[PDB]
mmCIF file of C-alpha atoms and ligand atoms in Angstrom:
data_model
loop_
_atom_site.group_PDB
_atom_site.id
_atom_site.type_symbol
_atom_site.label_atom_id
_atom_site.label_comp_id
_atom_site.label_asym_id
_atom_site.label_seq_id
_atom_site.Cartn_x
_atom_site.Cartn_y
_atom_site.Cartn_z
ATOM 1 C CA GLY O 1 -39.405 92.901 46.814
ATOM 2 C CA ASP O 2 -36.007 93.134 45.627
ATOM 3 C CA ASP O 3 -35.790 94.730 49.297
ATOM 4 C CA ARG O 4 -35.964 92.011 50.716
ATOM 5 C CA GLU O 5 -33.305 90.305 48.512
ATOM 6 C CA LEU O 6 -30.813 92.854 49.280
ATOM 7 C CA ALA O 7 -31.396 92.672 52.780
ATOM 8 C CA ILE O 8 -30.810 88.776 52.440
ATOM 9 C CA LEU O 9 -27.240 89.373 51.050
ATOM 10 C CA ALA O 10 -26.129 92.360 53.158
ATOM 11 C CA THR O 11 -27.271 89.728 55.826
ATOM 12 C CA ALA O 12 -24.758 87.535 54.575
ATOM 13 C CA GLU O 13 -21.686 89.594 53.981
ATOM 14 C CA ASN O 14 -22.046 91.044 57.252
ATOM 15 C CA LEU O 15 -22.224 87.816 58.901
ATOM 16 C CA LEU O 16 -19.396 86.164 57.098
ATOM 17 C CA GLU O 17 -17.343 88.837 58.466
ATOM 18 C CA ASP O 18 -17.364 86.789 61.961
ATOM 19 C CA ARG O 19 -17.752 83.280 61.012
ATOM 20 C CA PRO O 20 -17.512 81.072 57.659
ATOM 21 C CA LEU O 21 -20.573 79.518 55.555
ATOM 22 C CA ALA O 22 -21.094 76.590 57.993
ATOM 23 C CA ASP O 23 -21.728 78.284 60.952
ATOM 24 C CA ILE O 24 -24.124 80.545 59.307
ATOM 25 C CA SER O 25 -27.633 78.944 59.727
ATOM 26 C CA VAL O 26 -30.764 79.903 56.684
ATOM 27 C CA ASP O 27 -32.698 81.000 59.875
ATOM 28 C CA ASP O 28 -29.714 83.643 60.689
ATOM 29 C CA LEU O 29 -30.171 85.200 57.244
ATOM 30 C CA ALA O 30 -33.545 85.528 58.052
ATOM 31 C CA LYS O 31 -33.703 86.738 61.268
ATOM 32 C CA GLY O 32 -30.996 89.300 59.851
ATOM 33 C CA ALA O 33 -33.050 90.633 57.222
ATOM 34 C CA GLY O 34 -36.337 90.409 59.649
ATOM 35 C CA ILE O 35 -38.077 87.636 57.334
ATOM 36 C CA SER O 36 -39.371 84.771 58.319
ATOM 37 C CA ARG O 37 -37.566 81.082 57.583
ATOM 38 C CA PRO O 38 -40.047 80.208 54.483
ATOM 39 C CA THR O 39 -39.934 83.579 53.398
ATOM 40 C CA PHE O 40 -36.295 83.212 52.520
ATOM 41 C CA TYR O 41 -36.478 80.249 50.646
ATOM 42 C CA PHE O 42 -38.767 82.168 47.838
ATOM 43 C CA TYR O 43 -35.471 84.638 47.059
ATOM 44 C CA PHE O 44 -32.655 82.286 47.324
ATOM 45 C CA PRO O 45 -32.577 78.136 47.292
ATOM 46 C CA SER O 46 -30.222 77.730 50.035
ATOM 47 C CA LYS O 47 -27.630 79.686 51.674
ATOM 48 C CA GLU O 48 -25.134 78.653 49.127
ATOM 49 C CA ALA O 49 -27.090 80.453 46.325
ATOM 50 C CA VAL O 50 -26.767 83.177 48.810
ATOM 51 C CA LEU O 51 -23.084 83.069 48.665
ATOM 52 C CA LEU O 52 -22.970 82.196 44.913
ATOM 53 C CA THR O 53 -24.777 85.685 44.201
ATOM 54 C CA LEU O 54 -22.134 87.565 46.416
ATOM 55 C CA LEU O 55 -19.791 86.331 44.801
ATOM 56 C CA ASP O 56 -20.908 86.546 41.264
ATOM 57 C CA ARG O 57 -21.529 90.424 41.651
ATOM 58 C CA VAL O 58 -18.051 91.187 43.191
ATOM 59 C CA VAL O 59 -16.786 89.452 40.534
ATOM 60 C CA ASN O 60 -18.396 91.078 38.051
ATOM 61 C CA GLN O 61 -17.708 94.432 39.134
ATOM 62 C CA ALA O 62 -14.045 93.538 38.712
ATOM 63 C CA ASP O 63 -14.906 92.266 35.278
ATOM 64 C CA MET O 64 -16.517 95.396 34.717
ATOM 65 C CA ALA O 65 -14.274 98.018 36.143
ATOM 66 C CA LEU O 66 -11.455 96.302 34.138
ATOM 67 C CA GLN O 67 -13.719 96.652 31.137
ATOM 68 C CA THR O 68 -13.749 100.234 31.747
ATOM 69 C CA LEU O 69 -9.924 101.109 31.920
ATOM 70 C CA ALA O 70 -9.735 98.907 28.654
ATOM 71 C CA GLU O 71 -11.936 101.159 26.984
ATOM 72 C CA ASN O 72 -10.400 104.892 28.895
ATOM 73 C CA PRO O 73 -6.686 104.508 28.320
ATOM 74 C CA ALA O 74 -4.357 105.747 31.216
ATOM 75 C CA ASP O 75 -2.288 108.473 29.495
ATOM 76 C CA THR O 76 0.821 106.856 31.803
ATOM 77 C CA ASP O 77 4.275 104.448 31.461
ATOM 78 C CA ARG O 78 3.471 100.532 30.509
ATOM 79 C CA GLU O 79 4.152 99.818 34.309
ATOM 80 C CA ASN O 80 1.421 102.393 36.313
ATOM 81 C CA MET O 81 -0.508 100.911 33.339
ATOM 82 C CA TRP O 82 -0.352 97.552 34.812
ATOM 83 C CA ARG O 83 -0.042 98.659 37.984
ATOM 84 C CA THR O 84 -4.206 100.262 36.979
ATOM 85 C CA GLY O 85 -5.351 96.661 36.007
ATOM 86 C CA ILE O 86 -3.871 94.954 38.526
ATOM 87 C CA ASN O 87 -4.979 97.478 40.781
ATOM 88 C CA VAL O 88 -8.772 96.493 39.794
ATOM 89 C CA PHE O 89 -8.711 93.354 41.510
ATOM 90 C CA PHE O 90 -6.189 94.517 44.904
ATOM 91 C CA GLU O 91 -9.312 97.394 45.056
ATOM 92 C CA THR O 92 -12.375 95.088 44.214
ATOM 93 C CA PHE O 93 -11.322 91.717 46.276
ATOM 94 C CA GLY O 94 -10.304 93.467 48.942
ATOM 95 C CA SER O 95 -13.135 96.147 49.706
ATOM 96 C CA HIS O 96 -15.027 92.232 49.789
ATOM 97 C CA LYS O 97 -12.275 89.987 51.784
ATOM 98 C CA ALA O 98 -15.206 88.159 53.829
ATOM 99 C CA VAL O 99 -16.555 87.209 50.313
ATOM 100 C CA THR O 100 -13.520 86.582 48.817
ATOM 101 C CA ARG O 101 -12.832 84.286 51.463
ATOM 102 C CA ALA O 102 -15.877 82.380 51.371
ATOM 103 C CA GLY O 103 -15.831 82.408 47.677
ATOM 104 C CA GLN O 104 -12.661 80.480 47.484
ATOM 105 C CA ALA O 105 -13.409 77.777 50.386
ATOM 106 C CA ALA O 106 -16.958 77.113 48.151
ATOM 107 C CA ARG O 107 -14.620 76.137 45.330
ATOM 108 C CA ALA O 108 -13.976 72.733 46.974
ATOM 109 C CA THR O 109 -17.824 71.872 47.117
ATOM 110 C CA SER O 110 -20.197 74.204 44.872
ATOM 111 C CA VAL O 111 -19.806 73.296 40.971
ATOM 112 C CA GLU O 112 -21.486 76.889 40.202
ATOM 113 C CA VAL O 113 -18.582 78.426 42.216
ATOM 114 C CA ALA O 114 -15.816 76.787 41.027
ATOM 115 C CA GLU O 115 -16.998 77.543 37.287
ATOM 116 C CA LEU O 116 -18.080 80.903 37.600
ATOM 117 C CA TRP O 117 -14.574 81.497 39.052
ATOM 118 C CA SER O 118 -13.091 79.030 36.313
ATOM 119 C CA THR O 119 -14.981 81.455 33.670
ATOM 120 C CA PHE O 120 -13.835 84.423 34.647
ATOM 121 C CA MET O 121 -9.947 84.057 35.009
ATOM 122 C CA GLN O 122 -10.401 82.248 31.738
ATOM 123 C CA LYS O 123 -11.624 86.022 30.377
ATOM 124 C CA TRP O 124 -9.175 88.114 32.528
ATOM 125 C CA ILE O 125 -5.973 85.428 30.904
ATOM 126 C CA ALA O 126 -7.061 85.795 27.737
ATOM 127 C CA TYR O 127 -7.412 89.545 28.022
ATOM 128 C CA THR O 128 -3.434 89.593 29.800
ATOM 129 C CA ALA O 129 -2.272 87.094 26.779
ATOM 130 C CA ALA O 130 -3.880 89.727 24.373
ATOM 131 C CA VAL O 131 -2.526 92.731 25.531
ATOM 132 C CA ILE O 132 0.938 90.696 25.730
ATOM 133 C CA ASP O 133 0.512 90.197 21.933
ATOM 134 C CA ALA O 134 0.133 93.320 21.141
ATOM 135 C CA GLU O 135 3.283 94.892 22.904
ATOM 136 C CA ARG O 136 5.369 92.272 21.351
ATOM 137 C CA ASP O 137 3.805 93.109 17.789
ATOM 138 C CA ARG O 138 4.604 96.678 18.738
ATOM 139 C CA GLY O 139 8.170 95.906 19.654
ATOM 140 C CA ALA O 140 7.823 96.835 22.558
ATOM 141 C CA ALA O 141 8.160 93.531 24.464
ATOM 142 C CA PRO O 142 10.253 90.556 23.560
ATOM 143 C CA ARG O 143 8.538 87.505 22.256
ATOM 144 C CA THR O 144 9.611 85.346 24.954
ATOM 145 C CA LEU O 145 7.400 82.029 26.763
ATOM 146 C CA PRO O 146 3.614 81.330 25.158
ATOM 147 C CA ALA O 147 1.959 84.622 25.602
ATOM 148 C CA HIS O 148 -1.485 82.744 27.132
ATOM 149 C CA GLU O 149 0.981 80.269 29.854
ATOM 150 C CA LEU O 150 2.775 83.466 30.634
ATOM 151 C CA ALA O 151 -0.335 85.050 31.207
ATOM 152 C CA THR O 152 -1.874 82.415 33.064
ATOM 153 C CA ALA O 153 1.109 81.826 35.425
ATOM 154 C CA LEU O 154 0.872 85.718 36.587
ATOM 155 C CA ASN O 155 -2.810 85.067 37.078
ATOM 156 C CA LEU O 156 -2.795 82.230 38.890
ATOM 157 C CA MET O 157 0.209 84.113 41.072
ATOM 158 C CA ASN O 158 -2.223 87.358 41.560
ATOM 159 C CA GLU O 159 -5.239 85.219 42.624
ATOM 160 C CA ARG O 160 -3.252 82.746 45.903
ATOM 161 C CA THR O 161 -0.745 86.108 46.349
ATOM 162 C CA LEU O 162 -3.525 88.648 47.103
ATOM 163 C CA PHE O 163 -5.789 86.102 49.099
ATOM 164 C CA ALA O 164 -3.419 85.514 51.019
ATOM 165 C CA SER O 165 -2.503 89.248 51.806
ATOM 166 C CA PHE O 166 -6.324 89.491 52.497
ATOM 167 C CA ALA O 167 -6.220 86.805 54.929
ATOM 168 C CA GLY O 168 -3.315 87.649 56.497
ATOM 169 C CA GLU O 169 -1.945 84.162 55.947
ATOM 170 C CA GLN O 170 1.577 82.974 56.754
ATOM 171 C CA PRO O 171 3.479 83.490 54.829
ATOM 172 C CA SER O 172 2.349 86.797 52.804
ATOM 173 C CA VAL O 173 3.319 89.628 51.599
ATOM 174 C CA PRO O 174 1.830 92.547 53.384
ATOM 175 C CA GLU O 175 -1.379 93.850 52.134
ATOM 176 C CA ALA O 176 0.401 97.300 51.980
ATOM 177 C CA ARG O 177 3.050 95.579 50.097
ATOM 178 C CA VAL O 178 1.723 93.353 47.771
ATOM 179 C CA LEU O 179 0.708 95.818 44.596
ATOM 180 C CA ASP O 180 4.157 97.348 44.118
ATOM 181 C CA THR O 181 5.433 92.957 44.289
ATOM 182 C CA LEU O 182 2.609 91.833 41.836
ATOM 183 C CA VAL O 183 3.123 95.143 39.311
ATOM 184 C CA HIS O 184 7.021 93.988 39.497
ATOM 185 C CA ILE O 185 6.631 90.479 38.896
ATOM 186 C CA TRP O 186 4.684 91.087 35.844
ATOM 187 C CA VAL O 187 6.685 94.068 34.104
ATOM 188 C CA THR O 188 9.930 91.865 34.265
ATOM 189 C CA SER O 189 8.791 89.126 33.237
ATOM 190 C CA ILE O 190 6.478 90.191 30.328
ATOM 191 C CA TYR O 191 9.319 92.708 29.169
ATOM 192 C CA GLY O 192 12.265 91.196 30.272
ATOM 193 C CA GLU O 193 14.760 89.005 28.014
ATOM 194 C CA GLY V 1 4.081 46.129 62.873
ATOM 195 C CA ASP V 2 5.461 49.154 60.569
ATOM 196 C CA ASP V 3 4.339 47.044 57.910
ATOM 197 C CA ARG V 4 0.861 47.345 59.189
ATOM 198 C CA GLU V 5 1.483 51.084 58.880
ATOM 199 C CA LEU V 6 2.988 51.197 55.495
ATOM 200 C CA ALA V 7 -0.053 49.533 54.208
ATOM 201 C CA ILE V 8 -2.423 51.886 55.707
ATOM 202 C CA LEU V 9 -0.477 54.134 54.039
ATOM 203 C CA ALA V 10 -0.596 52.904 50.471
ATOM 204 C CA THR V 11 -4.249 51.888 51.123
ATOM 205 C CA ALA V 12 -5.301 55.274 51.474
ATOM 206 C CA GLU V 13 -2.381 57.038 48.319
ATOM 207 C CA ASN V 14 -3.821 54.566 46.252
ATOM 208 C CA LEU V 15 -7.665 55.267 47.189
ATOM 209 C CA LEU V 16 -6.926 58.869 47.232
ATOM 210 C CA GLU V 17 -6.333 58.245 43.348
ATOM 211 C CA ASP V 18 -9.985 57.603 42.707
ATOM 212 C CA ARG V 19 -11.968 59.495 45.489
ATOM 213 C CA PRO V 20 -11.153 62.716 47.896
ATOM 214 C CA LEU V 21 -11.122 62.174 51.585
ATOM 215 C CA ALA V 22 -14.535 62.376 52.200
ATOM 216 C CA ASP V 23 -15.345 59.421 49.970
ATOM 217 C CA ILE V 24 -12.887 56.740 51.822
ATOM 218 C CA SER V 25 -14.205 55.023 54.750
ATOM 219 C CA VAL V 26 -11.810 53.690 57.827
ATOM 220 C CA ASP V 27 -13.645 50.661 56.911
ATOM 221 C CA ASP V 28 -12.102 51.234 53.403
ATOM 222 C CA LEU V 29 -8.517 51.479 55.049
ATOM 223 C CA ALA V 30 -8.908 48.669 56.825
ATOM 224 C CA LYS V 31 -9.852 46.356 54.231
ATOM 225 C CA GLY V 32 -7.482 48.249 52.054
ATOM 226 C CA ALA V 33 -4.779 46.714 54.440
ATOM 227 C CA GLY V 34 -5.471 43.450 55.509
ATOM 228 C CA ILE V 35 -6.864 44.484 59.314
ATOM 229 C CA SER V 36 -9.740 45.311 61.172
ATOM 230 C CA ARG V 37 -11.106 48.713 62.066
ATOM 231 C CA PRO V 38 -10.349 48.647 65.635
ATOM 232 C CA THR V 39 -6.097 47.830 64.653
ATOM 233 C CA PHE V 40 -6.618 50.385 62.200
ATOM 234 C CA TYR V 41 -7.384 52.309 65.505
ATOM 235 C CA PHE V 42 -4.050 51.608 66.839
ATOM 236 C CA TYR V 43 -1.834 52.886 64.081
ATOM 237 C CA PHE V 44 -3.430 56.102 63.264
ATOM 238 C CA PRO V 45 -6.658 58.218 65.513
ATOM 239 C CA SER V 46 -8.622 59.153 62.134
ATOM 240 C CA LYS V 47 -8.190 58.845 58.443
ATOM 241 C CA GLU V 48 -7.386 62.328 58.311
ATOM 242 C CA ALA V 49 -4.353 61.794 60.735
ATOM 243 C CA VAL V 50 -3.233 59.418 57.873
ATOM 244 C CA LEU V 51 -3.478 61.860 55.014
ATOM 245 C CA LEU V 52 -1.275 63.850 57.404
ATOM 246 C CA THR V 53 1.288 61.475 57.995
ATOM 247 C CA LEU V 54 1.476 61.202 53.887
ATOM 248 C CA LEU V 55 2.039 64.911 53.279
ATOM 249 C CA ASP V 56 4.911 65.250 56.095
ATOM 250 C CA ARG V 57 6.102 62.694 53.656
ATOM 251 C CA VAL V 58 6.084 64.277 50.738
ATOM 252 C CA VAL V 59 6.757 67.826 52.289
ATOM 253 C CA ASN V 60 9.993 66.358 53.734
ATOM 254 C CA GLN V 61 11.011 64.504 50.435
ATOM 255 C CA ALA V 62 10.367 67.849 48.747
ATOM 256 C CA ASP V 63 12.137 69.652 51.917
ATOM 257 C CA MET V 64 15.463 66.875 51.507
ATOM 258 C CA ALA V 65 15.765 66.905 48.253
ATOM 259 C CA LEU V 66 16.003 70.800 48.146
ATOM 260 C CA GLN V 67 18.466 70.151 51.259
ATOM 261 C CA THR V 68 20.537 67.665 49.064
ATOM 262 C CA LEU V 69 20.717 70.590 45.969
ATOM 263 C CA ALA V 70 21.853 73.438 48.351
ATOM 264 C CA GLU V 71 24.588 71.173 49.727
ATOM 265 C CA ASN V 72 25.405 70.341 45.970
ATOM 266 C CA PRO V 73 25.560 73.348 43.961
ATOM 267 C CA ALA V 74 25.165 72.058 39.938
ATOM 268 C CA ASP V 75 28.073 73.695 37.741
ATOM 269 C CA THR V 76 25.866 75.189 35.886
ATOM 270 C CA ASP V 77 24.266 78.995 34.913
ATOM 271 C CA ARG V 78 21.927 80.861 37.128
ATOM 272 C CA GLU V 79 18.640 80.294 35.413
ATOM 273 C CA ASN V 80 19.511 75.793 35.481
ATOM 274 C CA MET V 81 20.133 76.464 39.241
ATOM 275 C CA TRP V 82 16.742 77.823 39.530
ATOM 276 C CA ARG V 83 15.276 75.310 37.144
ATOM 277 C CA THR V 84 16.773 72.772 39.344
ATOM 278 C CA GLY V 85 15.522 73.937 42.204
ATOM 279 C CA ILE V 86 11.857 74.486 41.195
ATOM 280 C CA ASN V 87 12.093 71.030 39.474
ATOM 281 C CA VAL V 88 12.201 69.599 43.266
ATOM 282 C CA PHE V 89 8.866 71.012 43.773
ATOM 283 C CA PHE V 90 7.790 69.920 40.025
ATOM 284 C CA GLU V 91 8.964 66.331 40.459
ATOM 285 C CA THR V 92 8.134 65.517 44.125
ATOM 286 C CA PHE V 93 4.280 67.290 44.186
ATOM 287 C CA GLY V 94 4.206 65.723 40.778
ATOM 288 C CA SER V 95 4.587 62.172 41.730
ATOM 289 C CA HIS V 96 2.474 62.502 44.605
ATOM 290 C CA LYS V 97 -0.692 64.139 42.875
ATOM 291 C CA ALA V 98 -3.350 62.425 44.807
ATOM 292 C CA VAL V 99 -1.544 63.230 47.953
ATOM 293 C CA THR V 100 -0.802 67.001 47.257
ATOM 294 C CA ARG V 101 -4.550 67.824 46.286
ATOM 295 C CA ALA V 102 -6.088 66.276 49.102
ATOM 296 C CA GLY V 103 -3.558 67.901 51.268
ATOM 297 C CA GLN V 104 -3.996 71.482 49.777
ATOM 298 C CA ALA V 105 -7.950 70.617 50.707
ATOM 299 C CA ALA V 106 -7.738 69.642 53.654
ATOM 300 C CA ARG V 107 -6.125 72.895 54.930
ATOM 301 C CA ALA V 108 -9.629 74.584 55.329
ATOM 302 C CA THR V 109 -10.059 71.586 58.015
ATOM 303 C CA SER V 110 -7.046 70.919 59.507
ATOM 304 C CA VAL V 111 -5.067 72.945 61.745
ATOM 305 C CA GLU V 112 -2.590 70.362 61.787
ATOM 306 C CA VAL V 113 -1.739 70.063 57.452
ATOM 307 C CA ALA V 114 -2.328 74.548 57.820
ATOM 308 C CA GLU V 115 0.351 74.465 59.956
ATOM 309 C CA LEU V 116 2.307 71.968 58.760
ATOM 310 C CA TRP V 117 2.362 73.853 55.267
ATOM 311 C CA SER V 118 2.636 76.964 56.452
ATOM 312 C CA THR V 119 5.845 75.993 57.647
ATOM 313 C CA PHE V 120 7.759 74.320 55.273
ATOM 314 C CA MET V 121 6.536 77.236 52.876
ATOM 315 C CA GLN V 122 7.803 79.688 55.086
ATOM 316 C CA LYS V 123 11.562 77.720 55.226
ATOM 317 C CA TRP V 124 11.216 78.024 51.369
ATOM 318 C CA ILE V 125 10.657 81.459 50.984
ATOM 319 C CA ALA V 126 13.572 82.158 53.605
ATOM 320 C CA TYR V 127 16.094 80.213 51.684
ATOM 321 C CA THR V 128 14.736 81.673 48.382
ATOM 322 C CA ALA V 129 15.364 85.142 50.228
ATOM 323 C CA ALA V 130 18.887 83.970 50.895
ATOM 324 C CA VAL V 131 19.858 82.870 48.032
ATOM 325 C CA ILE V 132 18.230 86.365 46.148
ATOM 326 C CA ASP V 133 20.375 88.618 49.034
ATOM 327 C CA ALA V 134 23.683 85.956 47.914
ATOM 328 C CA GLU V 135 23.170 87.016 44.353
ATOM 329 C CA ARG V 136 22.713 90.952 44.947
ATOM 330 C CA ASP V 137 25.328 91.306 47.198
ATOM 331 C CA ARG V 138 27.075 89.210 44.443
ATOM 332 C CA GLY V 139 26.542 92.029 41.786
ATOM 333 C CA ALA V 140 24.626 89.712 39.997
ATOM 334 C CA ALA V 141 20.982 90.824 40.847
ATOM 335 C CA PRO V 142 19.736 94.136 41.392
ATOM 336 C CA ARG V 143 18.089 95.539 44.226
ATOM 337 C CA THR V 144 15.030 95.687 43.501
ATOM 338 C CA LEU V 145 11.526 94.389 45.898
ATOM 339 C CA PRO V 146 12.745 93.289 49.319
ATOM 340 C CA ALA V 147 13.682 89.854 48.784
ATOM 341 C CA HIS V 148 11.971 88.133 51.166
ATOM 342 C CA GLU V 149 8.306 89.603 49.014
ATOM 343 C CA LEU V 150 9.478 89.266 46.333
ATOM 344 C CA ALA V 151 10.249 85.375 47.326
ATOM 345 C CA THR V 152 7.077 84.994 48.820
ATOM 346 C CA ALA V 153 5.319 85.913 45.997
ATOM 347 C CA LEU V 154 7.296 83.282 43.680
ATOM 348 C CA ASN V 155 6.804 80.947 46.222
ATOM 349 C CA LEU V 156 3.116 81.679 46.210
ATOM 350 C CA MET V 157 2.806 81.562 42.817
ATOM 351 C CA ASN V 158 4.540 78.163 41.963
ATOM 352 C CA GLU V 159 2.453 76.603 44.937
ATOM 353 C CA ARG V 160 -0.782 77.668 42.907
ATOM 354 C CA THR V 161 0.858 77.228 39.497
ATOM 355 C CA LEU V 162 1.989 73.986 39.755
ATOM 356 C CA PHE V 163 -1.080 72.676 41.448
ATOM 357 C CA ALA V 164 -3.351 73.463 39.061
ATOM 358 C CA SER V 165 -0.990 72.174 36.461
ATOM 359 C CA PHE V 166 -1.393 68.339 38.236
ATOM 360 C CA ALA V 167 -4.923 68.700 38.500
ATOM 361 C CA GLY V 168 -5.405 69.974 35.236
ATOM 362 C CA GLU V 169 -7.615 72.778 36.189
ATOM 363 C CA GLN V 170 -9.193 74.826 33.893
ATOM 364 C CA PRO V 171 -7.186 77.409 33.597
ATOM 365 C CA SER V 172 -4.057 75.853 34.484
ATOM 366 C CA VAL V 173 -0.179 75.903 32.188
ATOM 367 C CA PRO V 174 -0.014 72.891 30.586
ATOM 368 C CA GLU V 175 1.776 70.456 32.554
ATOM 369 C CA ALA V 176 5.180 69.516 30.009
ATOM 370 C CA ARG V 177 5.631 73.290 29.620
ATOM 371 C CA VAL V 178 4.731 74.832 34.042
ATOM 372 C CA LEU V 179 8.702 74.153 34.881
ATOM 373 C CA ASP V 180 10.001 76.602 31.721
ATOM 374 C CA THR V 181 6.934 78.736 32.666
ATOM 375 C CA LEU V 182 7.742 79.135 36.445
ATOM 376 C CA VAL V 183 11.589 79.739 35.824
ATOM 377 C CA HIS V 184 11.282 82.512 33.414
ATOM 378 C CA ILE V 185 9.307 84.395 35.755
ATOM 379 C CA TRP V 186 11.778 83.486 38.698
ATOM 380 C CA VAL V 187 14.663 84.803 36.200
ATOM 381 C CA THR V 188 13.388 87.706 34.699
ATOM 382 C CA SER V 189 11.901 88.905 38.509
ATOM 383 C CA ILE V 190 15.062 88.378 40.328
ATOM 384 C CA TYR V 191 17.734 89.642 37.975
ATOM 385 C CA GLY V 192 15.716 92.028 36.060
ATOM 386 C CA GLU V 193 15.484 95.846 36.391
HETATM 387 C C1 ZHA Z 1 -6.008 88.459 38.667
HETATM 388 C C2 ZHA Z 1 -5.182 89.613 37.919
HETATM 389 O O1 ZHA Z 1 -4.536 90.366 38.799
HETATM 390 N N1 ZHA Z 1 -5.840 89.808 36.628
HETATM 391 C C3 ZHA Z 1 -5.189 90.854 35.667
HETATM 392 C C4 ZHA Z 1 -4.284 91.943 36.084
HETATM 393 C C5 ZHA Z 1 -4.275 93.394 34.990
HETATM 394 C C6 ZHA Z 1 -4.254 93.563 34.230
HETATM 395 C C7 ZHA Z 1 -5.034 91.848 33.792
HETATM 396 C C8 ZHA Z 1 -5.485 91.052 34.373
HETATM 397 C C9 ZHA Z 1 -5.849 91.874 32.184
HETATM 398 C C10 ZHA Z 1 -4.918 92.663 31.132
HETATM 399 C C11 ZHA Z 1 -4.567 94.154 31.583
HETATM 400 C C12 ZHA Z 1 -4.050 93.995 33.156
HETATM 401 O O2 ZHA Z 1 -3.439 95.224 33.310
HETATM 402 C C1 ZHA Z 2 7.568 76.340 45.837
HETATM 403 C C2 ZHA Z 2 8.849 76.538 45.177
HETATM 404 O O1 ZHA Z 2 8.866 75.898 44.019
HETATM 405 N N1 ZHA Z 2 10.166 77.037 45.773
HETATM 406 C C3 ZHA Z 2 11.366 76.674 45.491
HETATM 407 C C4 ZHA Z 2 11.690 76.688 44.181
HETATM 408 C C5 ZHA Z 2 13.178 76.395 43.881
HETATM 409 C C6 ZHA Z 2 14.381 77.376 44.940
HETATM 410 C C7 ZHA Z 2 13.769 77.799 46.151
HETATM 411 C C8 ZHA Z 2 12.445 77.237 46.697
HETATM 412 C C9 ZHA Z 2 14.623 77.859 47.070
HETATM 413 C C10 ZHA Z 2 15.594 78.318 46.473
HETATM 414 C C11 ZHA Z 2 16.366 77.966 45.994
HETATM 415 C C12 ZHA Z 2 15.844 77.378 44.778
HETATM 416 O O2 ZHA Z 2 16.368 76.889 43.872
#
């Protein structure tokens, strides 16, 4: 039942390793999931809906892990706290690079994909701003830029910079260096005067 | 002669204000430039080649202005020097938002567009790294991250953050706030310990 649906999802993520979504057919997903093309359409209206589902699970996985961190503050310094949070996105999306890559491409053509990314980026930025505000209230960070504007730029930096690393774009920061790179920029811009 | 070519270019940039490149036809460019469809093909092989030319001029305009700044150091403080340089990209691309928007979309489908962006981003990052290195040599900046890796992340931040502002994406930094936002993050991460 839902086992056929997981098969479609797994086939799509596996196939997106080798070719873009345009080079994947609904017949390709059916064959890989051991079903017919009509049966596929019972589970998903299109191949784009398959990718939307895959991206939704990856994004919610990252959101939920961030939630877990929030409820369980790690006993460590401020730089490592920021590192642990940025690392949620590094590990979650870096463990699903094919879905991440195809998800960013689909933003240009899928209203749902664009709304999904926008909704969660708005959420993660608001949470970033609230932490920055808490730190300022504590006297731990100076009151420089508006916290929400600072948080917006730092989150967009991570989105673009992580994506470039995962895809091996030129230019990009090497994937083994990108976490330390982003943490440095977050910590200096949040706490610096 | 070249006056027909400028007409095609102007028509394309004007039309890209209202619709994506997919909704612009070669007939649309011909009509707007006062020529026939066969005559258009004498000047450009495709509508994508028209956008490539438009993006090439905008990118070279920004590159040349940055060159001008380099040769003519502004007598001012370090923060304003960085501001003046980031402002090249703010003003150049912000004065050609339609071409900027369509140019970023075409990266996903045009090898030439992708190579063009990559070549100039590599150039601007190397120049950023060389300035960071000079400042460290002078004792004006601490030796924290590898300069080229830091420069890579800060340039990708500006690319993504400026684009989001120009397009009015949600989320984005308001366009009237984005210059101060990026300068703060550049200056704190370059000079901060
Ligand atoms: C895209 C991205 O990396 N976002 C991000 C990273 C880290 C953190 C937050 C958001 C919320 C505040 C706490 C935190 O550590
Ligand atoms: C995308 C972008 O904003 N790049 C950028 C901005 C500013 C500067 C440089 C590159 C080169 C070093 C000098 C400088 O001021």
